[PDB]
Ligand binder design. Structure first.
Ligand code: NXL
Ligand code: K
Ligand code: K
Ligand code: K
Ligand code: K
Ligand code: K
Ligand code: K
Ligand code: K
Ligand code: NA
Ligand code: NA
Ligand code: NA
Length: 263
């Protein structure tokens, strides 16, 4: 069937010219709302949640892991690294790298998380360990953001990413202190106010991770604590036909607004 919410998302998509993917989980009743929920989309910087969570999982058996220093060298800088560039010829701890990757979307920091996991496949392996058979990370930063239509590399589906985000932030994929740390990091994101958050009532609390890439790819994954009800998990992924298309965070906000109006 096609629900009223799905019809509205289709109308939004038609006006956008691009391809929109949405997955909601309402933890009040475990129900789901999906739009292109099983189609693949390039994750771009939203993949940083999986990498940070995988390091948090490692830290469950190493009390000092998050304080371990990692050297930052001039050659490690990539296309966007506002935190790491302040530490060139020095070090950042794994906690500092996780916070920078999640809250400032520092791509050098993400590369250090990937390296701590043994490469992109270490991120995929963690996804599999927590029940996500769909996620794949194949490349490092910045090439994981090429976002080429039809390319399976560095993609997931909205359904899989919503389920994973639920298990990481509200479920038991991580230990309790690690889950709380991930939630704290997401709630302190600096980059999200134009995306899912912009479509929701002010009173609702959001923790999220955005992403963007070529093909006008514009993404956000969020945990939401609405006024007066149990938390929601919402993924909104968007990608466009031409390589140099402009970002469309407003489309993500519009998708979130439709979802909220449909509860
Ligand atoms: C993540 O998708 N990237 C790193 C950085 N993310 O900032 S955003 O989440 O606010 O878009 C810039 C865009 C992107 C990249 N292409 O490196
Ligand atoms: K800087
Ligand atoms: K920022
Ligand atoms: K792993
Ligand atoms: K699963
Ligand atoms: K902060
Ligand atoms: K908010
Ligand atoms: K094209
Ligand atoms: Na900054
Ligand atoms: Na900036
Ligand atoms: Na872009």
């Amino acid at each position: 069937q096609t629900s009223a919410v799905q019809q509205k998302l289709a109308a939004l998509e038609k006006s956008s010219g691009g391809r929109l993917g949405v997955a909601l989980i309402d933890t009040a009743d475990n129900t789901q709302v999906l739009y292109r929920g099983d189609e693949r989309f390039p994750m771009c910087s939203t993949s940083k949640v999986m990498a940070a969570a995988a390091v948090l999982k490692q830290s469950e058996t190493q009390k000092q892991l998050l304080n371990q220093p990692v050297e930052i060298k001039p050659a490690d800088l990539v296309n966007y690294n506002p935190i790491a560039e302040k530490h060139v010829n020095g070090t950042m701890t794994l906690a500092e790298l996780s916070a920078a990757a999640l809250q400032y979307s520092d791509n050098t920091a993400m590369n250090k998380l990937i390296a701590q996991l043994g490469g992109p496949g270490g991120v995929t392996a963690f996804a599999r360990a927590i029940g996500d058979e769909t996620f794949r990370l194949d490349r490092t930063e910045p090439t994981l953001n090429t976002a080429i239509p039809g390319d399976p590399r560095d993609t997931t589906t909205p359904r899989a990413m919503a389920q994973t985000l639920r298990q990481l932030t509200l479920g038991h994929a991580l230990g309790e202190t690690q889950r709380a740390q991930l939630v704290t990091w997401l709630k302190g994101n600096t980059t999200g106010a134009a995306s899912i958050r912009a479509g929701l009532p002010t009173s609702w609390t959001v923790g999220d991770k955005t992403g963007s890439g070529d093909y006008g790819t514009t993404n956000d994954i969020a945990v939401i604590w609405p006024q007066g009800r149990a938390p929601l998990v919402l993924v909104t992924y968007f990608t466009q036909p031409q390589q140099n298309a402009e970002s469309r965070r407003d489309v993500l906000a519009s998708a979130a607004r439709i979802i909220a109006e449909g509860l």
